[PDB]
Write a protein that binds this DNA or RNA. Structure first.
Ligand SMILES: [K+]
Ligand SMILES: [K+]
Ligand SMILES: [Mg+2]
Ligand SMILES: [Mg+2]
Ligand SMILES: [Mg+2]
Ligand SMILES: [Mg+2]
Ligand SMILES: [Mg+2]
Ligand SMILES: [Mg+2]
Ligand SMILES: [Mg+2]
Ligand SMILES: [Mg+2]
Ligand SMILES: [Mg+2]
Ligand SMILES: [Mg+2]
Ligand SMILES: [Mg+2]
Ligand SMILES: [Mg+2]
Ligand SMILES: [Mg+2]
Ligand SMILES: [Mg+2]
Ligand SMILES: [Mg+2]
Ligand SMILES: [Mg+2]
Ligand SMILES: [Mg+2]
Ligand SMILES: [Mg+2]
Ligand SMILES: [Mg+2]
Ligand SMILES: [Mg+2]
Ligand code: NA
Ligand code: NA
Ligand code: NA
Ligand code: NA
Ligand code: NA
Ligand code: NA
Ligand code: NA
Lengths: 124, 153, 122, 196, 60
RNA sequence: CCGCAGAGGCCCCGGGGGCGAAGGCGGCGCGCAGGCCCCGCCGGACCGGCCUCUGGUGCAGAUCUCGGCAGCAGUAGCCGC
RNA sequence: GGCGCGUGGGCCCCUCCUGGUAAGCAGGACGGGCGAGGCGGGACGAUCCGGACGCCGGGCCAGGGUGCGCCGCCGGGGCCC
RNA sequence: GACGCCCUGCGGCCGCUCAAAAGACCUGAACCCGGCCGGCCGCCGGCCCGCCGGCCCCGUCUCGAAACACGGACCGAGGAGC
């Protein structure tokens, strides 16, 4: 389906303050809370701070670059049910499904005209 | 346990583990011998054994003195480690024998193409200090591996 | 480089970014044109195609002149892609003739977000 | 192309400002006859100022700077460096595009020289204001080569004077040939329609 | 940005708009009477819906 | 609201698994974020999406506790009889 | 109207005062600020001059400035160690 | 942990058992380190990628912390309103 152009207000991730100087400090985001903290004050040279405002347009939120919406499945029944709106939703097979089940699921999906994002996996 | 791998498939190899010799001195000796022909390497090691040539130190050199035999090598430091020389000569002889017999190669075309020295766990003793204190007195062994082959290039 | 082969031009120089003593705006480049000494004379050269040569690739990067800067004949320019700092002090060409590069001289923001409500098809 | 400026009669600071701006724009400039640059003010005040400047040195080791140059060319170079970001790559490359000379040496005797009237003393100072040449100050603070510079400049000036008459005759001949030639006449007529 | 909004203005007030009870009967009744009031604007219905939103301590 | 451990249910012929679970390493994508997902290699027997319930439930600091380990350094030192 | 938390060492500017030779000293008063206020300027500063903040594109411009470092200037009248 | 081949001996290579060496042992992270192969100084932003611009060390008591105020070499696991 046609859609609006997707815009990402920020391309990089929000890194935690001072996580490049210590291994013990992981890069996952935390809010700075010190009395003298320079990133709490937001002086000119510091890195950006998380806030509502960077939020994505809700017309294209959660949309993959291909233009589909992701739907994770693990059984052939899960595929047949809840895929009448095949226009916007694509299927993704879960990590733990084996090769035999993957064969069966791919045959059924090809019969039903549903897109599969990870179709090449476990094919050697 | 070998850190060296390749398709040359015409290489002799040998190794020893938990060698009871200083790791730093052995590292220096192995780095010095690298890239030489085997015959020249034997001559060089025997010369180091009686202070005719020197082993230049490129990595662990803080207390190593300056000597005139090191002139023209890239550094002004060096020493004459004997335990390391004996060990390295043994391992090199074994590798040469493995190459010659397995691939029937002769000794005039063999070169020292690779080496690796790794730290190992040592024996722990103790020493006594003033005011009734006790400290440690450990050793610093190593693992050694040497590879001989046709030629670097 | 042959797209601009044998095209006469008026020489110019790229003297740095638009800036203050606190912030820098690399979207805009300041250019000095030979023979222009006044704001009005710059008004005589507004909206013309220019180019600069990347010392490595050799390919020319195109842009346009936008508006004056100051009182003494400097101008502001925008390029197809923003310029690195290594080009500061090089030469730019203000072509006498008219070329049709298509969209080779349009900045990236205008290219991608000309209208925010555009549609992608399949 | 290199810009060669004859620094005779120019004010040190104004010339430095112009040259620094030129250097930062990617041009190569050479300065000749730097001993003839002028500093405004009585010779006593200039000398006292320079002696005061020479008095600052690192207390615990004079080999750690600051260094005080005595030749006029190096004085001019230091003045220019004061107006440039020499600690960065951009400013460090600019100072490598500059050449400064006392007198006019053979490496530059064949160039075409220009001036900057906006920085010349006969247009910048009132008649009764005092002035002095950097050569005299340099000699008074330790420069050793004033007399040799003067001797060489005299010799070169006479030799150049010998060269002017040949240029005179050759120029006359070239002018007559250019007037005679027909192709140039068309170009001149075409340019005359634009006022050039 | 850059505006004065605290000179002749008071803080907002909080009032109940939903019954708050898990009983589904009361939710159904409140919604129905809200619809009726939306479509007629009568005062009796407005007061009735407000009363149906009250807490138990306020309904003797 | 995100995440952790456990309990009661669902998972259209009865949820996923030696045609390879948990965990580890590297790389895309999604989310303002806490986080989640997929792919490749390693590994060798278990695992959990949604609803309700429960808690010894989320670390950079405490001259923190226990374990491992660096520079200093081939250094100080191996002077009584 | 009900229930409840933190706080109970403050400091600076303007103008007005008291003790003291005075103090970046001690003690009071109307208004504002910092505390708990990002951003530009005052070379440099918690408080001064402007302006009080979601993420972006374009335009206009406060305070302060416009030889070169370093974005931005000319014209006119008077004085001038 | 076959056989074979080197070795004055110490040991080494090649292979054998097994689905696998899993070889004194499940998996095998971080800190720290050796070899080979590519680079030249941290973070943020722009870019054809090394140039330009910006950036004092956190936590804490405090009117006020970059402080010549205190704690903190590094990594893992544990660790405090029930
Ligand atoms: K204190
Ligand atoms: K103290
Ligand atoms: Mg994102
Ligand atoms: Mg002792
Ligand atoms: Mg004792
Ligand atoms: Mg098993
Ligand atoms: Mg428990
Ligand atoms: Mg910890
Ligand atoms: Mg030392
Ligand atoms: Mg000693
Ligand atoms: Mg108190
Ligand atoms: Mg006070
Ligand atoms: Mg406070
Ligand atoms: Mg305030
Ligand atoms: Mg400027
Ligand atoms: Mg960068
Ligand atoms: Mg910088
Ligand atoms: Mg405390
Ligand atoms: Mg206290
Ligand atoms: Mg105090
Ligand atoms: Mg602090
Ligand atoms: Mg823990
Ligand atoms: Na996994
Ligand atoms: Na606990
Ligand atoms: Na400020
Ligand atoms: Na097992
Ligand atoms: Na500060
Ligand atoms: Na204390
Ligand atoms: Na300490």
């Amino acid at each position: 389906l046609p859609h609006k152009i997707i815009i990402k207000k920020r391309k990089n991730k929000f890194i935690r303050f001072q996580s490049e100087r210590f291994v013990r400090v992981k890069p996952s985001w935390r809010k700075p809370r010190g009395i003298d903290s320079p990133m709490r004050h937001q002086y000119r040279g510091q890195r950006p701070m998380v806030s509502i405002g960077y939020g994505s347009d809700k017309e294209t939120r959660f949309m993959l670059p291909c233009g589909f919406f992701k739907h994770r499945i693990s059984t052939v029944h899960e595929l047949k049910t809840l895929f009448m709106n095949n226009k916007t939703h694509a299927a993704q097979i879960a990590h733990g499904v084996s090769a035999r089940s993957r064969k069966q699921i791919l045959e059924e999906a090809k019969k039903m005209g549903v897109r599969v994002l990870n179709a090449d996996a476990k094919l050697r | 346990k070998y850190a060296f791998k390749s398709d040359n498939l015409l290489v002799g190899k040998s190794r020893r583990d938990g060698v009871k010799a200083s790791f730093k001195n052995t590292y220096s000796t192995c780095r010095a011998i690298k890239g030489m022909g085997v015959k020249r390497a034997f001559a060089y090691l025997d010369n180091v054994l009686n202070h005719k040539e020197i082993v230049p130190f490129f990595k662990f050199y803080k207390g190593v003195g300056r000597h005139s035999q090191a002139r023209g090598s890239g550094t002004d430091k060096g020493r004459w480690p004997e335990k390391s020389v004996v060990v390295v000569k043994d391992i090199l002889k074994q590798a040469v024998s493995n190459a010659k017999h397995a691939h029937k190669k002769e000794e005039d075309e063999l070169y020292v193409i690779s080496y690796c020295v790794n730290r190992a766990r040592g024996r722990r003793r103790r020493t006594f200090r003033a005011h009734g204190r006790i400290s440690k007195y450990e050793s610093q062994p190593c693992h050694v591996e040497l590879i001989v082959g046709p030629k670097p290039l | 480089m042959e797209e601009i082969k044998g095209k006469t031009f008026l020489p110019a120089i790229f003297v740095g970014y638009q800036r203050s003593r606190a912030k820098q705006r690399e979207n805009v480049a300041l250019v000095k044109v030979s023979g222009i000494y006044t704001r009005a004379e710059t008004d005589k050269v507004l909206g013309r195609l220019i180019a600069i040569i990347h010392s490595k690739s050799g390919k020319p990067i195109f842009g346009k002149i936008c508006r004056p800067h100051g009182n003494s004949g400097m101008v502001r320019a925008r390029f197809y892609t923003n310029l690195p700092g290594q080009l500061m002090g090089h030469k730019v060409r203000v072509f006498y003739d008219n070329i049709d590069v298509g969209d080779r001289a349009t900045p990236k923001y205008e290219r991608l977000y000309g209208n925010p409500n555009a549609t992608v098809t399949y | 192309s290199r810009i060669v400026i004859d620094c005779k009669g120019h004010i040190l600071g104004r010339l430095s400002a112009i040259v620094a701006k030129e250097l930062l724009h990617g041009h190569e400039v050479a300065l000749v006859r730097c001993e003839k640059a002028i500093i405004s003010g009585a010779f006593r005040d200039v000398k006292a100022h320079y002696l005061k400047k020479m008095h600052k040195r690192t207390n615990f080791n004079h080999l750690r700077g600051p260094f005080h140059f005595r030749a006029p060319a190096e004085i001019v170079r230091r003045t220019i460096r004061g107006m440039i970001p020499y600690k960065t790559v951009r400013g460090s490359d600019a100072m490598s595009r500059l050449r400064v000379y006392d007198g006019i040496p053979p490496c530059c005797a064949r160039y075409k020289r220009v001036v900057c009237p906006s920085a010349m003393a006969y247009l910048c100072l009132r008649p009764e204001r005092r002035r002095c040449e950097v050569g005299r100050v340099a000699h008074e603070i330790g420069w050793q080569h004033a007399a040799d510079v003067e001797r060489y400049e005299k010799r070169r000036l006479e030799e150049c004077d010998k060269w002017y008459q040949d240029k005179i005759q050759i120029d006359k001949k070239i002018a007559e040939a250019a007037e005679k030639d027909a192709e140039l006449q068309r170009i001149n007529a075409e340019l005359a329609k634009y006022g050039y | 940005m850059g505006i004065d909004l605290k000179t002749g203005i008071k803080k907002r007030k909080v009032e109940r708009k939903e019954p708050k009870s898990p009983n589904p009967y009361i939710r159904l009744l409140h919604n129905a009477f809200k619809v009726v009031y939306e479509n007629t604007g009568e005062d009796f219905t407005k007061v009735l819906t407000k009363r149906l939103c009250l807490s138990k301590t306020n309904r003797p």
